[PDB]
Write a protein that binds this ligand. Sequence first.
Ligand SMILES: [Ca+2]
Ligand SMILES: [Ca+2]
Ligand SMILES: [Ca+2]
Ligand SMILES: [Ca+2]
Ligand SMILES: [Zn+2]
Ligand SMILES: [Zn+2]
Ligand SMILES: [Zn+2]
Ligand SMILES: [Zn+2]
Ligand SMILES: [Zn+2]
Ligand SMILES: [Zn+2]
Lengths: 139, 140
Amino acid sequence: TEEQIAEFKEAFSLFDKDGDGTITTKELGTVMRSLGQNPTEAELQDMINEVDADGNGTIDFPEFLTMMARKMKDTDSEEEIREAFRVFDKDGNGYISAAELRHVMTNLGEKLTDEEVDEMIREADIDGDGQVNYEEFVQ
Amino acid sequence: EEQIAEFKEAFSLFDKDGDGTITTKELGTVMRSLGQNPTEAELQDMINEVDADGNGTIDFPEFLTMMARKMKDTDSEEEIREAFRVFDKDGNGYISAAELRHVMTNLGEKLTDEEVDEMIREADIDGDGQVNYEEFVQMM
Ligand SMILES: [Ca+2]
Ligand SMILES: [Ca+2]
Ligand SMILES: [Ca+2]
Ligand SMILES: [Ca+2]
Ligand SMILES: [Zn+2]
Ligand SMILES: [Zn+2]
Ligand SMILES: [Zn+2]
Ligand SMILES: [Zn+2]
Ligand SMILES: [Zn+2]
Ligand SMILES: [Zn+2]
């Protein structure tokens, strides 16, 4: 456990009174109340929306992690996209090359022709440089 | 950091014609330049241990495998595990449904609770409701 997952798993399961894997405004409100806080039904749905990546109005364990990390959903989202980008950028120079895309896609089970790889890099290459950078990846 | 600049320096030495790939011909020239007379078979062999895409020649990412001391199967397994780690947000060794949904969404694939639960279904071989590493390797 990191800056403790185990503790966050503890916390989450306190909040998630009914064990359904999500924390509602209802359940969130009960806990805040127990600590002598009086949030409104809007303050609560706001607390949830800060982290509600799948937009369902409720907090699942992953999104709960965002909360615990202090982050908003947009920031958490950007960390995850970067971890993805890093899987492809094997040499870590900030750009995915055609060879890297082909190499890693193949290693992840998706064998692509030199045709399909060159096309995928074409499409995403906005800077015009023959390589896919982080901002370019983000689409 | 310095490792990669020197690996990049090395690759360009080998890849005399700036191709972006290293052939048995080019590989053989450098070995010849130093101590050895490898056979065509020995060279094709050297390449085959890192040729992930099977095209018979060494590109730069495959060249990194060599320089990491690895074979292609080992390199491949590390890259899968890095992928698995993107999904396993809490790092306990299992991709939950909530995790798959959460990370797919954040990578620009919004899936229904329906499709996520199906995806975990199909890859979940031991029936525990979660996708472990070996199960992930199978799904890919
Ligand atoms: Ca609940
Ligand atoms: Ca570019
Ligand atoms: Ca190759
Ligand atoms: Ca997990
Ligand atoms: Zn949610
Ligand atoms: Zn997240
Ligand atoms: Zn790169
Ligand atoms: Zn060449
Ligand atoms: Zn590799
Ligand atoms: Zn399983």
